[PDB]
Symmetry: D3
Subunit: 149 residues, 6 copies
Amino acid sequence: CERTFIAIKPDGVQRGLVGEIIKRFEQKGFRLVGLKFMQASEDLLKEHYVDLKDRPFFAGLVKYMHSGPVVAMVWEGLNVVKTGRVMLGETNPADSKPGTIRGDFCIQVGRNIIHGSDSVESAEKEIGLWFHPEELVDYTSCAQNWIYE
Amino acid sequence: CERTFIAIKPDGVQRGLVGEIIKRFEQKGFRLVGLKFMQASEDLLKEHYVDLKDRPFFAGLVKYMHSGPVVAMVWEGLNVVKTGRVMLGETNPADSKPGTIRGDFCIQVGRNIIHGSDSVESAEKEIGLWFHPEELVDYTSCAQNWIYE
Amino acid sequence: CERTFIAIKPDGVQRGLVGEIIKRFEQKGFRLVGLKFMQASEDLLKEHYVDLKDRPFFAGLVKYMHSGPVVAMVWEGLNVVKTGRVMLGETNPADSKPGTIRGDFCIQVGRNIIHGSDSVESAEKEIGLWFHPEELVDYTSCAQNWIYE
Amino acid sequence: CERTFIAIKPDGVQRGLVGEIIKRFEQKGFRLVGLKFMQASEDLLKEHYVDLKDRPFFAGLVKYMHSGPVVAMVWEGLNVVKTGRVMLGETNPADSKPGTIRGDFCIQVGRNIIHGSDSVESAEKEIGLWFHPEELVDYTSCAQNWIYE
Amino acid sequence: CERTFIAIKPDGVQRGLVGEIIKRFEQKGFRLVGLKFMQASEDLLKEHYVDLKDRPFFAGLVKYMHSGPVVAMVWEGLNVVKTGRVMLGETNPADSKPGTIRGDFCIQVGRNIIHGSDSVESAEKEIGLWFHPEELVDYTSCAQNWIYE
Amino acid sequence: CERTFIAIKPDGVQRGLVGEIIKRFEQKGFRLVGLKFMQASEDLLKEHYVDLKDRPFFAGLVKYMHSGPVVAMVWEGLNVVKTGRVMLGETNPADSKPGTIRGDFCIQVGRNIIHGSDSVESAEKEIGLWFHPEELVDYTSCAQNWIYE
């Protein structure tokens, strides 16, 4: 099945939202395939935020995402990339609706708690950038036949 | 007051979402008038899904809804049919928004956890098809005057 | 597996605790085998409270448990009778510890929200008294092998 | 930072939603600056609902908001006035989306549980009308740098 | 009915536990009669902690409880003083059991999140010390007859 | 500060309890220092369960803990080893009290959802056995001074 990359940013860890966030994906029916607590290197972050390499805020972005530990995750399921984004809510917490992670839990786009892959192709980039393939665990949910036909 | 029929499907029971679902209707202010745990017969299911009698997936639908027990419910209140549907979310979990039952809890339209009456008229059909009239309990909530003017 | 009878009393329904209570038994791993929303008849209640037939408060007890609808349940699992009682907490909410249903949710022994069978033998009495055998649904949880060895 | 006035109405207190509502604003990241449990006087209420002084329902509105205690609050943060309104949901619970306070918790516009300032200017009116300036507490959240850049 | 004084300490407010704590008392069935957000004066604190006036840590205690705003509450109900203490848990979070406020939410006795009156007589002292009598609101819960016989 | 090793077992992952468990440790005030999703090797498991090397069930234990992925964690705080065990509850879910992880979420000792180090010395063994020292992240909580004096 399809897979997406979700990172809980420094502010999401600091504010004690790690279990809250993981619970949303579990209760939805998505399968945890990768989980990892790290301090992302500025190099790794530079590669991650490469489409913004020439934007001005880039320097600060990489500085901040390096300022503390992140929880890197890989989740799997039908349309997990788009649905994951719906579950996170709008990138700017101000346009995020109640019920979503950014809608419920944060305020400002610079401290917006979480990242999710925006496309299947960027998902595959980011999973590959953040995880070794032997760090991705494959198993079958006991609930699979009740989640999918 | 108005009444709607809500059924928790086999996957909703299997995944342990019965208490979760009932809680959403209680905390909203709607009144439980009927509650019943059953295995719906293929006959009963055929009558329930009669507008899809000639559609192709019909056979599988009836087979699946018979594959395990369902929780049949009747809820009552102002606009409960439309609001109930809003609370369930879009029939395809993929269009369901976070905050709704299908939005929070499931992924695929074939395993979409729950059913709610789509109209007042289909509500009355379904309540009559699934419940004997002496199975419907009438009482007054202690909170009624704080729920309604 | 072992089975117990749990009834949510009129005050538990009035106070909107039905979904909350069911959720505690689901998340524990117990299997719902019977669920039923009714107004218990004074006759049925008299048989239920027969060990207190000659106690004085008996009249009031039967009057109260008839004063509104109850949710009658049958739950199944290893030691469900004793564990169900531990989950409910002490019969007097005043001795009930936080974390339990009566501990979390109620105050006075006369309005103590819930009933659970006190023994395997009284469980079998009460299941037989409150449920027709065809109202008890048998199925296998998708999670069974992860709940039991 | 910006500030808004939020009042939990008599029905919100009666239905035990005070901690629920406060939790939504805390977990969002907004800062509690004022909190106060009162019975609003008909005079105070008349000033509060002054734009509806000549509307017909006015009499009933003031009578109801006086019928029981309200929890008056002041919350602070980036765009708290508009975001607060988004968090409350539509004034008519019928147009309120799941995930929001009125969407999750109530049904009818006459018993709609909560009030929030509709503009920065009405916010400043209402804060001044409901709170003495020494009742507003200023402090710095330990989480501030993780909520704002 | 009996009344107790409960104060959420500076660390409880800082850590965003105000709504959480109030919710435990509401869902239990106790009645909020007083609610107030303040910075306790060192004088007021000295009177509050008068039995520890000659203990050494006293100076620090008063300094800390003055270091930030507290939520002062009065709650009412059958045995609310002792039950309130049971709900808070042991004063040292290390002896607090899961399910209780201190058991769930904190670690160290010096940052133990909350205060509750230890006796009916100290309750009456503290309510009188912290609240003006016109700040205490009297009303009847819609749920009273379902909480008490 | 003191550190303990906590592993969510295959049944805890299968049953969707990962976010629930992590939330209990976060909300308590403990600091996540290590997080890791893996399939434990039979060799690693043999070293982990070495005090039971000569017990008979050993073979099955290692087979089961290898049967699916586990979430390995390191948590840090005052008395985290003993408190962690209190939070998990009794090793046999049957003696576990409501409010605890095993008390709330599981039934049978063979499927008891979670592991926590039983001593400071076994904690140090297990952290060293399961984590590389560069996988343990050090940072300061924004809430530290509100958790500890």
